[PDB]
């Protein structure tokens, strides 16, 4: 019966956000508009979020005990009501009650930010739909009545980038049936429209091209005419149906409950604000609006391993029979991995008994909002030994330890993909960063196999690749680190005790990587089997104290350099790169690359620049991804099984021995001892320990927009 | 509130039945393996002989009668002018009447006697020699360095010599540590024992290695010690920490997470057969080959006829002779034969279903390994699939992932190998293997860094690679299958609507692999990103029904072909290979390769022989492995974290849609609906469903030998 239970990196709070918005409205001139109903020629505030502190100061505070650096915020402002409109980046502080505001644009980017680089606003999307649905589609209502039950029952979906050339803002939009309670993405009606929305005055916006069921037209006029002329043979795309194409609700009623996990003697970790603490682990967590999930000041048994691990960008490159598909290259940070974090459904997205946590933000609005259950944090019994030995030889003993990990997770739903961002903390001292793609695939109307598979009636599942970039600022036993590569080789040799014979002598090769360029591994290149970052200092046995990067990635072929667009996500070309850490190089991407990748705001390749990486504060940049050719089993959704991709950070002579030796949960007993004796073996007391019904919270869901 | 066996391993009776029959028909002269000497006649092994496929299938599908249930016996025929090992098929069970020598049929000639595995008694005899005859000759030295006075133990290596016919084995000497691994306590002495002679009296010691130097005999070593040329390095007898212990110095804290089935378990085990809602298969263990599964059926339909471990391999490098020539072909010892008991709540989850294995190896009566297998459902704490829609329609639809696992563990000397087969709700099968347990060590001398890392006082952790081979006989939608490779490519192109501009057009490349040699991928070769086996027949959307092999492997560089030994495990050279399935090609290895790899009994490369694989019964052969350079954190044991290696088998247009759409456990609800309303959302009723204390069984352990 019955059964128990330094925030310098925290994301800005409701107050802090409000505080900065007040200060902005005051100091920014009226004509300021609510971003959420702004127009191109308006002035407004697009985003307000935490500006991360410099490392030197942050550390001085965390370690040396000096005072905290100014807590600041960064605001992105669209300045439209202006002869030469610009986007500007403004640092506002110091919180909790700000007094200054500095334009860092020219500092950071060496010049103004072109207005065309700004992300398409929510209002801008609405205006575009007004044009399409009021001014444009009616011109073809003859056709639409015949194919598409026109009478409102159709929806548009954006693509990106928006044109062919720096400056452009023309966007292809596909049209789909507005299915109810299920993904529309699988119901392309066959029509795409090239909208030019560069003009500051929506009245001047035009439609450059039209694609319909396999053919280009110049206007909806033509397309309607040609349909009327009788040289457009409409194949009828249905409005309605049943199965996974049409639904997510299963036709099969609940059977017996699946397995459930619980903490029989209370949870073994705490979350206070942005800070998690456990027996072994300590870190602060959070979300960049655009860059997405991040962790800081990660400490294993009190000692810092990493200053920062943050998602940096995500990328989806498509191919297709149609214009939308065949030119789409989402640089998802230009929308926002944080901005589009969705709530975590208890018992689906994370285990029911996880600790859920809310996120607060201020984006494209005046008042801050909240995503409820944005994060989840929990311990998972992996059902699998961290370590184990059974000795039947000479001495009869057993010694092992079941693996229980600590997880932190957010999910981003950008249009149809749901990205899943795991950071898993292992009891061995290892950190694992994973990401899964799930959700709906993106589809096109089907009209010879070069561009994907047919996944349902009239539907091409368009081929594409996923990839993601991570900043990993390890500070292994201090700031000053070196990069080591180790591998294997065989060397023919006469057998010492019988030289008439030949043996193949297995050996270890070892090289220190001295310059940045030697630590930059292009995709498709051979990669050292052991690569690690290490300190000057050694462990008990005289080896440099190291942490090793090990990669789980099936990376797709990158967009060719021959493409002008590529410089906008040049990180795609590397598997891994280690560079000097620098304040002026905080990120591999920028929210402004999505709309102008031809003139990238940040260009990652520039960071790799022929310097020493021999004894500096280093930072590793890891790419992970894969190629996806959709298939029937992606309908309704793509499963996560086998699609996880990422990397491990594992200790390599960092410790003097395996930390888990002194685990509070390790089991050990001799063959002559009594394995059922509770005092001998803790597992024997488990049935007492766990003789209680768990107190499960009432199911709540974090709602919608 | 509380909460066809046509593939089954032979039972106690069947084993007894066969041994009785063998005793009778094998003439007198027949000794018990545990007592046998080289010149004796004895029965080494009795285990299931797997049925032919055509007959097995006829029974399983067409309903015809079962094929004869038979057994295979390995017999050592020593009491003979020309001694041989012979393979004998005995049947039909339950009460056998015949017995057929298949040796010459199968291997095209007699099995040389020197290929036989070293018997337990043979190991004991060898120790008599060492400890009675030999070591006393160097007791002067041994008293000085090693607390000689019995307190030392030997460990074998393999293969045994330099050339087909040889049977000389290096044995290292270690302190017989109590209740912890001896493997970390090499005293610095290895002895080359020649035990080829049928008369142990004639066995000799060809060489001696001590603390860095070679001697012809123990006479020599002692003569040279007493002559003042051998400088002993005292290796301690005793100590504390992970070098010496597996018992933690830290007392139990609060219990870790525990998983349970709140409305009963959702699978059954009847004998060798598992059944669940989705999955159906028979499981078991080959004495030598190890874990295997048969007649795997997703929702009633066969995906795989057989998935079986085939061989495991550990290739070493080192400063000393044992380390530098060791190549364990573990099947020559036996992955089943050395299955250890699974400790409840360490090796598998506490509430797993544990199952015993019966065997008859190197003895006259059958024995049992208690809790050899475990079978359980695991909540992965991670969604199989999920979508959150804030866009146009407000809905959520997902499904938490619960997998079905089957696991055994083999402890071969120091390593404990974990063998997972995980069955996913998506229709995917996953085969994993982890290496844990103790590393193998050597005494540390010399300044090279070429052969590993120092992991404790005076201990070299010797570099080596692990690898494992699996037979995967998929029968995708029937027997007749083809092999497909798909990948990606970019193709420059004029932008259709703006030909002044260039786009990189992503496309899918596809190729049918026609001949065996085209499906044979060497290690280090580029591999198609999508490789699958498929049927002639298509799904609803016209694509061939496929299952795809996706590989999680960090494979080490293979032993060079230049080595005569290599032919004994030539599968090591491939990542993957598809060949025609053939009755006369049942296995990629043989228990007789370990001792004569120079004249291999089975040579895998011979299977790949320039035939069609276009529309035959095909079988894939997957290699997985990795390089291990030991480091401090391998002491006391190597952890499983990130060391799992294996592959997935995923449906690729096999179905018409994701079968998890019709999951009994999928959650779905619209934003306008009530997510707490139990009738709407099953997760809401969970706190009722799981308001009960679990009835945990009293802890038992399966004991030792
Ligand atoms: C990008 O656009 C922003 C928005 O217009 C520009 O900010 C404004 O720049 C001028 C400085 O050239 C400032 O106003 C001026 O104030 C001084 C006295 O303080 C006076 O000489 C002038 O009569 C004028 O009013 C003001 O700092 C600033 N306004 C706001 C609301 O921030 C920005 O400079 C543009 N920058 C680039 C590089 O494009
Ligand atoms: C490997 O070793 C075994 C040692 O027994 C050989 O098997 C034996 O082969 C002999 C033939 O030399 C069989 O004897 C035959 O049966 C009757 C017994 O009444 C005998 O009088 C006949 O004249 C005939 O020689 C014996 O049955 C058989 N035993 C078994 C278990 O097979 C075997 O030949 C050897 N194999 C090879 C390939 O060298
Ligand atoms: C690890 O290096 C520290 C720090 O190293 C600086 O010394 C330069 C020669 C060069 O190596 C530079 O990269 C490196 O950052 C060593 O201590 C330093 O040692 C010097 C002696 O040469 C002293 O005079 C300095 O006070 C001290 N400087 C600092 C900044 O600490 C240290 O010896 C070494 N330790 C090991 C085990 O390698
Ligand atoms: C080697 O050392 C082991 C470890 O002590 C000895 O194991 C003990 O042996 C005695 C005698 O049989 C038993 O009563 C104890 O219960 C054993 N302990 C364990 C943990 O098994 C073993 O006997 C020694 N082997 C030798 C000397 O060869
Ligand atoms: C697929 O093949 C089946 C018969 O297979 C043989 O037929 C020949 C044309 C030759 O290609 C052989 O190699 C084949 O193995 C046939 O009976 C099936 O119905 C066929 N079905 C389809 C849809 O292709
Ligand atoms: C989806 O359906 C309803 C019509 O019942 C509509 O109000 C909604 O907005 C549709 N999507 C649109 C209009 O974009
Ligand atoms: Ca660093
Ligand atoms: Ca740099
Ligand atoms: Ca087959
Ligand atoms: Ca063949
Ligand atoms: Cu995808
Ligand atoms: Cu290993």
PDB file of C-alpha atoms and ligand atoms in Angstrom, chain A residues 318 416-417 419 437-438 440-442 462 464-466 626-630 634 638 643, chain B residues 530, ligand 11:
ATOM      1  CA  UNK A 318      14.716  17.405 -51.469  1.00  0.00           C
ATOM      2  CA  UNK A 416       5.485  18.014 -41.445  1.00  0.00           C
ATOM      3  CA  UNK A 417       8.689  16.697 -39.676  1.00  0.00           C
ATOM      4  CA  UNK A 419      12.416  16.268 -34.935  1.00  0.00           C
ATOM      5  CA  UNK A 437      12.929  12.372 -37.522  1.00  0.00           C
ATOM      6  CA  UNK A 438       9.341  11.312 -37.379  1.00  0.00           C
ATOM      7  CA  UNK A 440       4.579  13.090 -41.748  1.00  0.00           C
ATOM      8  CA  UNK A 441       6.588  12.825 -44.942  1.00  0.00           C
ATOM      9  CA  UNK A 442       6.190  15.534 -47.534  1.00  0.00           C
ATOM     10  CA  UNK A 462       9.681  12.586 -52.323  1.00  0.00           C
ATOM     11  CA  UNK A 464      15.333  13.809 -49.427  1.00  0.00           C
ATOM     12  CA  UNK A 465      18.113  13.898 -46.884  1.00  0.00           C
ATOM     13  CA  UNK A 466      18.103  14.994 -43.265  1.00  0.00           C
ATOM     14  CA  UNK A 626      20.949  10.303 -43.482  1.00  0.00           C
ATOM     15  CA  UNK A 627      19.149   9.827 -46.799  1.00  0.00           C
ATOM     16  CA  UNK A 628      15.446   9.053 -46.789  1.00  0.00           C
ATOM     17  CA  UNK A 629      13.701   7.454 -49.751  1.00  0.00           C
ATOM     18  CA  UNK A 630      10.160   7.273 -48.611  1.00  0.00           C
ATOM     19  CA  UNK A 634       6.246   5.905 -43.858  1.00  0.00           C
ATOM     20  CA  UNK A 638       7.825   7.842 -40.448  1.00  0.00           C
ATOM     21  CA  UNK A 643      16.484   6.432 -37.932  1.00  0.00           C
TER      22      UNK A 643
ATOM     23  CA  UNK B 530      19.685   1.492 -49.378  1.00  0.00           C
TER      24      UNK B 530
HETATM   25 CU1  LIG C  11      12.890  11.837 -43.817  1.00  0.00          CU
END
